[PDB]
Paper text:
In the nucleus of the infected cell, influenza polymerase (FluPol) uses the viral genomic RNA (vRNA) as template to perform synthesis of either capped and polyadenylated viral mRNA (transcription), or unmodified anti-genomic copies (complementary or cRNA), which then serve as the template for vRNA synthesis (replication). ANP32 is required for both vRNA to cRNA and cRNA to vRNA replication. ANP32 comprises a folded, N-terminal leucine-rich repeat (LRR) domain followed by a Glu-, Asp-rich intrinsically disordered region known as the low complexity acidic region (LCAR). First, it stabilises the formation of the replication complex, an asymmetric FluPol dimer comprising a replicase, which is part of a parental RNP and synthesises the genome copy and an encapsidase, a newly synthesised apo-FluPol, which binds the 5’ end of the nascent RNA replicate to nucleate formation of a progeny RNP.
These particles comprise the FluB replication complex, which is similar to that of FluA, with an additional third polymerase forming a FluPolB symmetrical dimer interface with the replicase. In the FluPolB replicase there is a rotation of ~15° of the PA-ENDO(R) towards the PB2-627(R) domain when compared to the FluA replication complex, allowing the FluPolB PA-ENDO(R) 63–73 insertion to contact the PB2-627(R) domain in the region of W575, a contact not observed in FluPolA replicase. Conversely, in the replicase, the PA-C(R) 609-loop interacts with the PA-C(E) arch domain, reinforcing the replicase-encapsidase interface. FluPolB(S) is less well ordered with only the core visible and not the peripheral domains, likely due to flexibility. For FluPolB, based on the observed trimer structure, where the third FluPolB forms a different symmetrical interface with the replicase, we speculate that it could have a distinct role. It might assist in replication termination by binding the replicase and releasing the 5’ hook of the template so it can be copied.
Author numbering:
A (entry chain C): 1 to 200
B (entry chain B): 1 to 31, 34 to 189, 201 to 643, 652 to 670, 684 to 752
C (entry chain D): 353 to 375
D (entry chain A): 195 to 716
E (entry chain E): 359 to 387
The structure:
Amino acid sequence: MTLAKIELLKQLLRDNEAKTVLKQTTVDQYNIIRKFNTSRIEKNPSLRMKWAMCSNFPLALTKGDMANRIPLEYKGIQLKTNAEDIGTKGQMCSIAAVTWWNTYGPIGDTEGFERVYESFFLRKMRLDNATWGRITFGPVERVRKRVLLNPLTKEMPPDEASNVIMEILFPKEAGIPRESTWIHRELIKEKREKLKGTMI
Amino acid sequence: MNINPYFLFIDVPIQAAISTTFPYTGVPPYSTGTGYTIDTVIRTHEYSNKGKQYISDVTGCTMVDPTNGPLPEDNEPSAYAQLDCVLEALDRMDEEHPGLFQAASQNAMETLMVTTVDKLTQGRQTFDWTVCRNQPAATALNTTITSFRLNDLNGADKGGLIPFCQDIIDSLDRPEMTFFSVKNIKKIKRIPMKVKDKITKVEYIKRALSLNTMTKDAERGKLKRRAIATAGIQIRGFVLVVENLAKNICENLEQSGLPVGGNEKKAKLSNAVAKMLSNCPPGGISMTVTGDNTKWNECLNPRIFLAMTERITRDSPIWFRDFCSIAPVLFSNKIARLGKGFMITSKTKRLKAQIPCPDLFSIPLERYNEETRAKLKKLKPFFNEEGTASLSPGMMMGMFNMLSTVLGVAALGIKNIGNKEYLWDGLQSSDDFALFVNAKDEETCMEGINDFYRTCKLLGINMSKKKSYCNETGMFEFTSMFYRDGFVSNFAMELPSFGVAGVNESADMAIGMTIIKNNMINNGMGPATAQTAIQLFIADYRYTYKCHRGDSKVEGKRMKIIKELWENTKGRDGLLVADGGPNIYNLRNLHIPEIVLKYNLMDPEYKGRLLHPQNPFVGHLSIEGIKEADKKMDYDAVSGTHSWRTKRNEEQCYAKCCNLFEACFNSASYRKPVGQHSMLEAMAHRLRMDARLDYESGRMSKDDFEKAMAHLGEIGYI
Amino acid sequence: KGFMITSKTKRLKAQIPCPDLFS
Amino acid sequence: DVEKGIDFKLGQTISRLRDISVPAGFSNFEGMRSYIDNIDPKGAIERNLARMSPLVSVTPKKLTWEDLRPIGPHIYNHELPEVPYNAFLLMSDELGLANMTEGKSKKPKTLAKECLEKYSTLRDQTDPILIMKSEKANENFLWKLWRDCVNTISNEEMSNELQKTNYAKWATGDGLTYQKIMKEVAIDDETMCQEEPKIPNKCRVAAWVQTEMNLLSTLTSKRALDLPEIGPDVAPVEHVGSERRKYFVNEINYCKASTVMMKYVLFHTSLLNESNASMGKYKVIPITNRVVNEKGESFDMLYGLAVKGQSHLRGDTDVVTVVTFEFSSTDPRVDSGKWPKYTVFRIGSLFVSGREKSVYLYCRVNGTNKIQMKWGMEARRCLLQSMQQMEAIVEQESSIQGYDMTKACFKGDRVNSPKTFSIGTQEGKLVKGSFGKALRVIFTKCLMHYVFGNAQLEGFSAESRRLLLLIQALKDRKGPWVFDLEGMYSGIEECISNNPWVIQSAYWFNEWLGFEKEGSKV
Amino acid sequence: TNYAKWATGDGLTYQKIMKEVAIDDETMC
């Protein structure tokens, strides 16, 4: 893929616009470059989704070797097509293939969900073991308060949160650790160990 | 017996059953907008026709100046705002608050020096002058950046918004203006190409000052249609800065309903009414005026906003004072585009033709309908030859919401006129104000109300005497929220939100359930109502994605596969509602994603298949929306086969450059990268390191390494 | 060939063939 | 460089624009800046007010009951025409061709085929008896189009597209459209004028609206509204919610308004599906519904057919034409004022239990768009609007006495009488109504707010809410004052033009205001 | 060419339709 990366880079540079923009915009400016998208946002998502679900192949599949696991038509039902794509450069597919994959196909690893989605399973644990009581139908006095919607493992400001996330799951690009990793070293090591062994 | 639904109000208060009055279940009204735009221009100039009429020598378009104009002698709307009175109100606000103006201006300047140009990509559709149309903000900004490169204009590459605004202001002086225009060349096929076009200085000034128009069709509770205006990218930076400053000022003001939204606004409303009830003298009356302002933007002169900006920044750097005063100047000399023009038809020949606006007066007026005849006979004085209307006075809806709110709060905060035995205070938010007047009797209450009305008329504000009423404190309405005897019914208007979110199965489901739970928390939706909402939403969700219960005899393409899966897997309580599984969601667990909810009940094969580490239905580039659902609403979902994306409905340059950079540095997609070097060299170094590591690990062959190296060699960073 | 009938308001014409001269 | 500071200086054109964009009395922006920075107002507001004319004021007038008068008196006037039936589909006149089915869900085309197969007399009827051709539609066009519809539905092939494709083009009037030319010729030609705006007619109070309001709000042995299951309820709160939900659905499900709502939703869903799937070909669409009786028999009901025109539209506001043929048991001659837009036949008769009753076909051309087309499938929210308020009602009761009353309000208990609202009237005597009947009335009100919804309805409701809140304030003796009452009244009454629901809402508002006026004596 | 079409009156020509519709239309004489 790194060879594919270099070949794609060379092909992109062959055009002069890519050469001039790449050599002009610094790394910091990249953000601006990314935000120059079409912004042709769908005006009504409900109608779009309704129409798409009735189309032959609305699903936009990423090009890869997964498709070979499933025929282009199974049990006389069309699943995927080999026609090229312009929006995503991949293939097209239908929810039929998705349902078949949920039915048959490769079997993945169940370990990752034990720890990766720890917050959700903790929510479920707090719900299941909760004890209910009576209901008081009388009027309730309520005050408007600034409340934390969800429990947090270790509340930190957004910048420290981003730095910790990068230090956890992005081993590269970790120049000069600030005065925040030492404070959260235990969290760093715990999350690092827990998330190791995954493929998400 | 003849039924009568209104009789429900005999046994119930109106506020309690207020939700049923609103027809927020039928088809909202929907639509040429040229007639409405011309009517709006006509009304805007009519209200200020007595001002000073002159001719701009920078653009040649007629201008009407109502500020410091004759004081109105009638109840009709008046834009004749006296500058001294505005400054008096601002001074009273400044005295009533400790250096609020200075703090707000300084904070606005600081956040401005940190703002980037790309912030202008947010918002809604914007007027693009290179094509003279309405285009997405991102595309319009990109096109203007590209055009500026040709005329020796730069600063977008320099980053911050200061250089972009500086070279935007510079562009107004260039003797020419070159750009790329779309040319639909005939070849029969119509192929679009880029043509290097040029326009003069006056044409460019007119294009920059022009305000595009559209019909406000989405409105729900108004019979007559209003026109919404979209401005160009050359005003977005200044309007944004002034709006941020006004937001900073108004946030502290306890009289301002904005920008706080939700239960905060209810808290403010109840707190204000309680405060006024507490402050009443003994045996006196505190009357509440339920007000609904009209012509709230056809009477506000941008010159008053220029004066307000200058007074607000009394003590600030000269450069910032000049910068933040550009938006009122651009708005005070704005021009309005005019829809797509009227349509004339002959029925004796079954012929019809739409007449473009520039040709409005190329036809004898005796052929338009009498109403449009009068409209054009009145619009002729301000009609530009190009097909635009010179609209100096007044404002279009939606531009200075915060600044207009600040002016309204300034009017509210005077609190007295002539030391008369009364006081007043209230809530104001963007064309909706509720006032409270405390006195020793009703007569003095209305003396105060009349004084406040007169004072408002001295600033261009004209409260609607037809859409407003007055009563005793403890019962009123503010921005469609009703208060009565301490009971604030959140008027149930979030009903049109239970449809599928149309992003994907799991995400749509999570969004719907979170919407249900939020409505339960906020609007007082009862448990039975929430259960029925869950039922209806699940019905619609199953229908829209053609996935009903596997047992049910319904026929469909995916339904056959769902039926197969129903018996091919033993554990039948773990399937998802997208896989014909049984619904499990209830009130107690609307806050838990179902995938984790049914994780125990699934089967090992089923969970392995659905929660595969790699899914051809899941892509990295599809993750953009995993955080916020377009208002940006946070939803919690789970990675899986049902996390797919729908098909799509210097562009490629930027797009593929960014895509490749993300694919190289996978960390870029999450957090802003940092570096003072060209992107090319960063990518080259990273790719060289990656190639060496891949080879040393045996993942790449030797011939592969040589090839890669050569390429990276050519590039010039090896 | 028959006859020709026409509506001026709709600006439409049609040919009635000889076999259909009484329909 | 930290000794310099930011540099941002205004050019020449922008500086000139600033110079000329100064309020009156100034000649340069430096002058305005100095004036604002230096001059101090110390009572300028009072100085301006001390001279402003005394002819400007809010005109504060106290509001009493007598000032409030009936809204839209022109509906009473008999010189105006009776309001017509402009709703998309028949509501209280639908005739359900009902076939018992094991429960299998089948394509609408096959369902309609079978339903007609059961009734051979109506399927094979080919000699119509014109009861009335309304004003413009052609009897030959409509009858031939309906015959093609029946033939296509009953054809062996699964295809549900019209086999003619050319007769329908003129039956639906697609070809009766103007041809667009370029602007130059229009400028040169003198006869190419501008069409005068077509204002809605000013009509009077009809009678069919009241009868439909009554009939759609009554229990029927047939139930169609079904809802998906939810997870087991383990908390007490969700147990109470389940009890309330059951008590509500046991009431709403059997009202005819629920069946009409489901028919509308299903028809619009099928219309959207056909439009998306088929773009430029005429299609046949049965108006299908599914109805379960108390015994659990899942009848499939065919209510008519509809030809869909060419829906090849890029935009949403673009209109697509559809012609509806509807089975009914009502002879329009009984009240011809209700059906001035409909061309009808008399395609036979049927026996429900031994009592023979005629069977007519109401044919009408109409047009919709993707917006209303979607809202058709979002019309189910009426149900929610029906429950929320009642929920609140019940909750209020629960606030009074501690226990839960949902059984008490609905049916009553040994300690509390059943809750009764005021629902109707007769001979000037208002009548009470059970909790379930009030819930039905609210649900039907919401359904009508949808079906008869347009700009007029919004302008009427959002502006008569002012008077509603003023009356509410008056009933609490808040002594509300008003500034311009006639302005509000004119605003409200400039919306009662031709919408049947708007006219009936005005009529009921006037009657209820009279009732409140007569009851205010205490 | 486009302008001459309407200037010369050639574009003001009645449209031919199938005999079925014409017989079924009572306004055609």
